[PDB]
Assembly symmetry: D2
Homo-oligomer: 498 residues x 4
């Protein structure tokens, strides 16, 4: 019997765990400490959540270590670990309306989007990785033979062991699922730290691990602060790998802590300032649709959002006019209402950052075409924003907004290399995109863009089977695809002589 | 015209460059600073070598950046890059005696061993990776289709860009080759820092890159200190990846420096304390031969050296008697003489460390069965040493010697799990081995050993196709094999909608 | 509604379809022609089954073609084809008792075995292959560039189109499942011809595909003769691939027919005469247990059955004595009775072959230690048989029995090559095995055995992730594992210049 | 010494072996039978060549079988097999002018083209496959464990054994190289039958294998007839695999022969009627350059030649005018003149067929815009030909000419699916291309074309790393690329219990 916060909302009765999940049980933090999680649609407290302390991290890690070394998870067939993860995907899908409603409450995700992406992609992620379990394979390798003797050399793919996963607040359940699905399919056990401001879908996900029959200790979830709980995961001597998504600064600090403790493996998905180049020979009405989606999707709280749009000179004014016409049709609203297509920002501090960003944009001289302000209504809503006449030296040409602000620069007709050079002049390299009907330009621009993902005539088209990760200061290592498994496996080489 | 230090020795004329190699030219360091390199066979100065400073590191990085971004290396076909690397392997083979002779003078490597391993394995490495260049392939991925439209997703494998490689002194040419062949096969450019005490085969290799036609800037070599040159390569904003082999403490510091500068990728091959478990049912004579080799190969200055031997109770005394008989047969002496099979230690400070190490083993209670001291002859020779009665809590049971010191413990007849536990009780996890004629026990032990390489009925059997790298605090990432390439490549995902 | 033959048996009410399955529906054959299917436990008629004619085949091929070119199967995402195959496996699981009872009636499979293998391995096969759908990937390849232009080259893995699958009677549902799971996972559609004597689980399977939602025409099932229905599948100009398992002679004829019609692709899994070599140093009691299993599993009706046991001279007589003891404990009976462990032979003509085989064995001089005859009871039961003093020139040392007949030769102590030579002196090369505790012997024998599969210290250990197929006259191509997908996919190379 | 036909030509003194090559030696055929090989530039006899008989094929197969089972080729490391194949490529490069001269004389290949393609690509093929030898790798597979025991499953890639290679006359040395490089890289030995009409570069290549140190018997070459030598190779009980390139009818009879002997493996590269679709938004002058090359390259004797061009209605007439302007600039003449761009057809009977083919195209109503006839000059030159007003039911719209005959049809502006239907209405499926600047068309067209290779905005762009092979009646299996290796390897599954 679990304690729940019960809430009747969206024609459902939600049952939300709110405690730490350690060793297959929900338990209070040390000294029963708690904190409040806030609903961004009206500013209210949703409920109190356990606030993990250092001694709770140590309990979670111990539980994970025990589950890995002596529990069932380390003894079952790869195929049977697969069945458990498939079953976990079924359980999530049976609770999909509920998880999507929690995410609407906790994170501001518009409900219909949350059902299809926040939740629907997490379910795809578990199913996808469940199918890898018994298809992760090593090699047999034709090495030189120590004649007159013989040699056989093979590699075995083994789990790393206990991992810690630290994730951000923009897609709480989906980021959790990206990393956890690959981590568990590889045979590891895990301690997860959701972002403090968005713990609830993680804790409900935890309960679902019980329903799916995941052995106790395999998954542990610790709502709590980065500087305390995240830091202790990075320093812990029994943790063998950290997977991190979040900002560049915090990723530097996590990589440093992995170094100074036990050289634990790390992967990092860090910030972006992703460019989208739109040529005059593109399909203009699709460029406007996909151009808006690259900025406004998920209220701009999107790791791969296009952070600059470069638009060729001859279509630039017509492009801005069409975007303004579509912007005006967007419906801002409570994320639980069916007609809503733009929900609130995730939390108050982030809303404050966005207001300040756009003041700085106006102050340094860009043209504010629309938006820029907090919407007058309760909660933390931000008006979709369009800036034009952005120049390369401006702050908003360099800094990632993580909000629904479209930042447009022009480039001269016929220029390809000059616009590439401005798109690549950033220390980030997470994503990028190009719109053009011309196959030669599309192939040449996708070769020259210095980013982990290049979208061509589309944007935001991620897929559980297509690896996602950045270059340069956006980090290294992939989530999704077969590539994500290599972060959670190690290779043992075995060489016989006979 | 290159300046050389010329020397008649070993039936050849050595022509040794002694300057920095930057942008395809040998140059003095800033201020013409220099340092001496010392011949371990007699303590004498071989010659003066330029001493790279921070502004030389900057010069080497800029030439590597320019060779990558604009020079011919970044434009030729992958297949033509492979031709240039095969040609470099051919030029190395044409100079094989001269390379091996330099290695005997600079590092103390016995000549006949340097010919077959230091040099011979380097040549194999470049020919192996040269064959990879036009076989490195990305993927096409069956993603979900945004109906009524279609999607095509592919991955491209691309070079990471400028790399820094920092290597230890135990196999100067071979460690450089392992990392540099995989780095260059992937299409990168590189700045290499050899261990300060062993620069000379690296600078001769630099000269061979000119004879092979490798474009200027692709390879840059900076003899100099880790605390100055290595440090600046780890800090540099234009270096994108660091490959490192060396001690655990230095690899922690490098990883930390990668994090605090620009999140550069990093691979680490670090210390080891590798266990070799010898069961009573092995072929005993062969266990002696291979057990000696696991300790004494290359005067024990060998990353995968067995740091402990566990010998089953009922064969322990007979194994120790036969080892002592074979150690009496070893011929210690000048590495250029054909009968030598035990050359000097690499440099004086390391000889001192081994003298102290064996003092500590004696002090804490282990039985010194032979050796323990400097050999009374010029240069830095150390006696092949055997300790018995070693107990798990002893410093010599935990610390890596990196010298020709065989460290023997017993284990009870029919124990398997108990000896495994003792073999695994270390934060290292680089290599390991088991001798047994019993198939079940061999397979089971290899599963249970927590190390990146497990040898079965052999030892030291590395191969350019077989990935090599450690677990836990021995680091991460592979050298050799196809797996090595992944440290030097990045993956770009490209998604079209049409 | 579907017509069923209803049968109360094994505490279930079986509902068995008995018509052709074409285009999503059960229909009579042309002219309403039918034939009887025979219960091997008593010789009685289970029921009448539609007897496909040429016009039926053409219809089935037409429906498969339309389903591939225009139907839903050809349009859905690979991921959603995978979900359908996993739902199919779930539905087979919900009917596992029923399927295993049908297979007990139709093929004489002992019910407890059929539940674990015939049916339980079928379910594993569909789940394994379902996971492959969205993980089948092509390549991007670094070809030479047509400077000053660029080139991109990729490969796409596509379905081959309409396939025909012709299977034997020994594991009717499991052989169907092996091939169909890989065929459908690769995106193809299929016409399946079960062995005429065992149509019933295939027909039941057909019904299950309707329950699982597989689009109509993707799976079509035609009970009927090889010489008529199988032959027309091999000749048909719209079938693009045949997958075949059965005898070598029919395999040759199907290959020839593929060639003369439209060069359709073909895979073949043909006979075997698989040797098992048992050395004096093996675990003897285990060798008896696994040696018994290698011959008598599934009444000897087992493609991978060891057809010759070679037993080292010093343990031969004691091996034979222990085999006779275990043979005497076998309970021969009705496959529905729980204590049975040896069921009847599949059909009468096969029983006659086995009687003639053992007559020839006795005639040519082998020693008959037990069995050799039809058991005195209704049905087609065959007494488990052991022959010793088998010499390499004897018919029964060359020809595959497919029956519960253990065929034993000696080899001299210490011989390894000489027994390899005898074990390899056959035109077949399907499976093989070796029992020995010696690692060096096991690795060497497994290198020298000329067979698709080598078991070491076990036998009959097939796995749905492990590819299974023959060398020489046992055919080519694999079922099971990633390799099986290659028979059902084609590779298209796309090369752009830009 | 080897007997040569000596000929002073092209500034060289060619030395051409003319005998059978069996077991490392040039020998006369049985009864000293010989036949003439004919220079197509003037109809003269070049020399007499041995004419292999049945007993000569048996000798070559015996020598290939001994070389594989007992000789050095079966025992050396995979890496050292690769060094010998890279040494063979170097010897071919040292003789490249003499090989290209022999191909100009024997096959009519224009010398400058024979240097870069017939010869230059053969050299790239041996270098590329030489790099695969020590990178062919098997797998280790996470099967279910037979608890309380453990299982290890691995696969080994092994050579198939003795192979027969049967090749056509259009690129004598290059088709030999494509199949032989991959066959030998995988470890096999081979008997090669070159086209009877073009034996000479094959025999010169056999002599190069001696200079490269390939062990005697690993390569055997038997000039003579398909129906005698080729037939006996396909029937031979010790040949395990046939690699064939040529016409559909012969490929069907070969596959039937493999089936009726010993189920040997077979790969088949058969005819083509490859379509090239030129849209109105292409780059027109390039389309004309590439369109011309798609047909006329190597005098149309080119397995991937475009056999139909479809040109969108609004550019058709301008396309044809530009074609005729280009064809008028083609210089026809002796293949040694360095301005020749159009050499003679390969032999007399093929020229005759081209004359009949064109008479037939005029007769059925197509418009002859130029050519259609033998050029009046000694030898077998055929005039470059252009047909317009070709309709889908015509013989020349269905049958492959294999000659320099451009076959053009219009298709309607804006149709895409309709021209695709017509491009796909053939039982061939070897190659195809599309010229268009529009990315959406190029991608959609490449997905819908039913051909093993699709070129986009280029043609004839084959590459040793990019697999090449047909669909439908164009056969199956690939040459080139990693995929070619799989035709020449078998997979052994080895499964342990411990
Ligand atoms: N098993 C292994 O794979 C492995 C390999 C090598 C060594 N070891 C262990 O380490 C010991 C060797 O000691 P060591 O002091 O010679 O090795 P080390 O300090 O780890 O040196 C390795 C390389 O790192 C460089 N380096 C030092 N500080 C650096 C910094 N701050 N930034 C960048 N690079 C830096 C060194 O330069 P300098 O030339 O100035 O020192 C040297 O080239 C051995 O006794 C052995 O136990 C283990």
């Amino acid at each position: 019997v679990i304690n729940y916060v019960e809430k009747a909302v969206n024609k459902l009765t939600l049952q939300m765990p709110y405690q730490l999940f350690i060793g297959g049980e929900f338990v209070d933090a040390e000294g029963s400490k708690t904190y409040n999680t806030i609903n961004p649609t009206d500013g209210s407290v949703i409920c109190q959540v356990s606030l993990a302390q250092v001694s709770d991290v140590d309990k979670a890690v111990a539980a994970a270590k025990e589950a890995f070394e002596n529990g069932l998870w380390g003894k079952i067939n790869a195929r049977d670990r697969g069945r458990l993860l498939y079953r976990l995907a079924d359980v999530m899908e049976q609770h999909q309306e509920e998880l999507a409603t929690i995410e609407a409450l906790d994170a501001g995700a518009v409900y219909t989007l949350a059902l299809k992406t926040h939740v629907g992609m997490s379910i795809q992620t578990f199913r996808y990785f469940a199918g890898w379990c018994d298809k992760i394979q090593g090699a047999t390798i034709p090495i030189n033979q120590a004649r007159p003797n013989r040699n056989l050399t093979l590699t075995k793919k083994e789990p790393v062991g206990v991992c810690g996963i630290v994730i951000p607040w923009n897609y709480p359940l989906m980021m959790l699922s990206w990393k956890t699905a690959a981590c568990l399919a590889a045979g590891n056990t895990v301690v997860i730290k959701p972002a403090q401001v968005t713990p609830l879908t993680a804790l409900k996900f935890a309960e679902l691990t019980l329903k799916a029959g995941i052995p106790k200790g395999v998954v542990n979830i610790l709502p709590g602060s980065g500087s305390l709980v995240g830091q202790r995961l990075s320093d812990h001597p029994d943790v063998r790998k950290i997977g991190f998504t979040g900002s560049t600064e915090v990723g530097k600090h996590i990589m440093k802590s992995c170094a100074l403790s036990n050289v634990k493996k790390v992967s990092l998905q860090l910030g972006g300032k992703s460019p989208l180049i739109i040529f005059a020979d593109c399909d203009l009405n699709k460029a406007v649709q996909m151009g808006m989606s690259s900025v406004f999707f998920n209220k701009g709280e999107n790791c791969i959002a296009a952070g600059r749009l470069f638009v060729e000179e001859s279509i630039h004014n017509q492009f801005v006019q069409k975007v303004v016409e579509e912007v005006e049709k967007m419906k801002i609203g409570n994320p639980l209402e069916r007609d809503t297509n733009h929900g609130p920002q995730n939390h108050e501090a982030h809303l404050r950052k966005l207001v300040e960003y756009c003041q700085r944009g106006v102050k340094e001289g860009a043209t504010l075409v629309c938006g820029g302000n907090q919407v007058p209504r309760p909660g933390f809503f931000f008006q979709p924003t369009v800036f034009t006449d952005v120049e390369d030296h401006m702050y908003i040409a360099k800094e990632e907004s993580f909000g629904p602000i479209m930042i447009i620069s022009r480039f001269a007709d016929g220029d390809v290399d000059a616009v590439l050079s401005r798109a690549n002049a950033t220390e980030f390299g997470l994503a990028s995109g190009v719109f053009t009907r011309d196959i030669n330009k599309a192939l040449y621009v996708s070769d020259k863009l210095q980013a982990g993902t290049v979208f061509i005539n589309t944007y935001n088209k991620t897929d559980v089977a297509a690896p996602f990760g950045g270059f340069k200061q956006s980090g290294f290592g992939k989530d999704l695809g077969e590539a994500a498994l290599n972060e959670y496996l190690r290779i043992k080489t075995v060489t016989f002589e006979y």
